[PDB]
Write a protein that binds this ligand. Structure first.
Ligand code: FDE
Ligand SMILES: O=[N+]([O-])c1ccc(O)cc1
Length: 137
């Protein structure tokens, strides 16, 4: 289930973080707008960019803690509050989270592994909704 999925992603987090984030950028190429230095690079080059590898693991480090503190795929309102505030997110929509979660779900569904894809769908939908209540456009 969802709890074992957090343990699975954490056991190889930098490769899952990178492969899921690349799935996202490849599904939603216009999403590179928010990351201008990622444009004009393949997946093998992005992996070679220090901040790509660092930022994508740190995103995933956070997402996995929020997942871990969730109950029944419902994040802590305190965790949506932290996210909306961030600093980087000054410019960021719930749309961009929904997109990342559509990418994450398809990646899970397409893998040979027993990921609880429906739970991740639920989680993203619920994180979006909590970000929308904590004051994200
Ligand atoms: C679209 C999108 C989505 C997202 C999501 C997310 C989640 C879930 C979580 C997160 C977190 C974060 N962010 Fe985040 N995000 C985004 C975006 C971004 C950007 C653009 C930035 C800046 C950096 C770079 O990469 O360049 C960030 C960013 C970020 C960070 C750090 C890095 C810096 O800036 O310094 C962190 C930790 N973000 N995030
Ligand atoms: O997954 N994410 O939201 C990310 C991943 C990498 C990055 O540089 C910024 C945001």
């Amino acid at each position: 289930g969802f709890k074992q999925d957090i343990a699975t992603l954490r056991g190889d987090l930098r490769t899952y973080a990178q492969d899921i984030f690349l799935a996202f950028l490849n599904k939603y190429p216009d999403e590179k707008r928010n990351f201008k230095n990622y444009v004009g690079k393949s997946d093998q080059e992005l992996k070679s960019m220090a901040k790509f590898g660092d930022h994508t693991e740190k995103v995933f480090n956070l997402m996995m803690e929020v997942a871990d503190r969730a109950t029944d795929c419902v994040p802590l309102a305190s965790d949506a509050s932290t996210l909306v505030q961030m600093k980087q997110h000054s410019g960021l929509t719930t749309g961009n989270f929904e997109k990342l979660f559509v990418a994450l779900v398809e990646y899970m569904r397409a893998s040979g592994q027993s990921f609880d894809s429906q739970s991740w769908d639920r989680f993203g939908k619920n994180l979006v909704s909590a970000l929308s209540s904590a004051g994200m456009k």
